[PDB]
Design a protein around this ligand. Structure first.
Ligand SMILES: N#CC[C@@H](C1CCCC1)n1cc(-c2nc(Nc3ccc(C4CCNCC4)cc3)nc3[nH]ccc23)cn1
Length: 289
């Protein structure tokens, strides 16, 4: 629907693994009145990566929710390599950097507003049997001071018709410090592993993204910075099996930390649903207000 001749590059907005997003201006009339959009492209157009990208585009096109970034269209040059995904541009960037910038004006009830919006987005995802697999504040975008949106779906899979989990080990680097134990050990991804990751997101928010307090720093201090390569993952597994967990962040109430620890249950079936998390978060929010 968008033709590449009219997309004018302004700057780079973010990079993941295998993809990047650029701020561009769609200006078909060539009079600087077109709208600013975000454009996602692959950094190395493999055909495996291209099929993954087509499936991701199909997933994002099928989602319509207040806390999910909006699909706008696609764009391809000759043949259909150079495939690009057009999305709405969200003016405040990712929640990670935003929260780092404004820690002095974001109080706990605002964090709980963000938490509840994320939970509604994730529950919507679950009703379509989608598993996000990459829930982290770096993947949350800020539309304005009162609204966040889930922003990337490059790792998202659809559950098989007959099972409640999806087994997958991609080559490349994996956000192992947001991963549930069963995802580290058996590469199993389910709604419950997304709930584990959501607990890590809650931790992130309440640390206000102090980098020494990031999940990687804390886990690597708990297992010792000696470890290299595979050993890291191995020790992580073993640390999670003896109920090692990230500590309560400074200033976090015990109710919030209890939500976190309940998401970090070793037993996949004993973890809360996203609807229950939304309820608990909304009642804490209403108690504070
Ligand atoms: N998710 C997610 C993570 C990554 C994707 C992961 C895989 C590829 C990239 N990522 C997505 C966006 C992104 N950013 C924006 N706006 C925006 C506006 C301003 C700023 C700056 C903010 C502060 N001042 C200086 C400039 C940054 C961003 N809009 C978007 N729409 C769709 C995506 C998207 C940015 N990184």
């Amino acid at each position: 629907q968008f033709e590449e001749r009219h997309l004018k590059f302004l700057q780079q907005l973010g990079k993941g693994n295998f993809g990047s997003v650029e701020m561009c201006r769609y200006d078909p009339l060539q009079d600087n009145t077109g709208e600013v959009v975000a454009v996602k492209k692959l950094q190395h157009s493999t055909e495996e990566h291209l099929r993954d990208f087509e499936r991701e585009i199909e997933i994002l096109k099928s989602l319509q929710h207040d806390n999910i970034v909006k699909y706008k269209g696609v764009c391809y040059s000759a043949g259909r390599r150079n495939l690009k995904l057009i999305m709405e541009y969200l003016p405040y960037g990712s929640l990670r950097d935003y929260l780092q910038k404004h820690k002095e004006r974001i109080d706990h009830i605002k964090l709980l507003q963000y938490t509840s919006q994320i939970c509604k987005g994730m529950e919507y995802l679950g009703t379509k049997r989608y598993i996000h697999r990459d829930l982290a504040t770096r993947n949350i975008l800020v539309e304005n001071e009162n609204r966040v949106k889930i922003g990337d779906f490059g790792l998202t899979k659809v559950l098989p018709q007959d099972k409640e989990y999806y087994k997958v080990k991609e080559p490349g680097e994996s956000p192992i410090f947001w991963y549930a134990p069963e995802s580290l050990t058996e590469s199993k991804f389910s709604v419950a592993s997304d709930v584990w990751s959501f607990g890590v997101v809650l931790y992130e928010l309440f640390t206000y993204i102090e980098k020494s307090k990031s999940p990687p720093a804390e886990f690597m201090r708990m297992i010792g910075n000696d470890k290299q390569g595979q050993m890291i993952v191995f020790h992580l597994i073993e640390l999670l099996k003896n109920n090692g967990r990230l500590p309560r962040p400074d200033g976090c109430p015990d109710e919030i930390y209890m939500i976190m620890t309940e998401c970090w249950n070793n037993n996949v079936n004993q973890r809360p649903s996203f609807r229950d998390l939304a309820l608990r978060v909304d009642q804490i929010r209403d108690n504070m207000a």
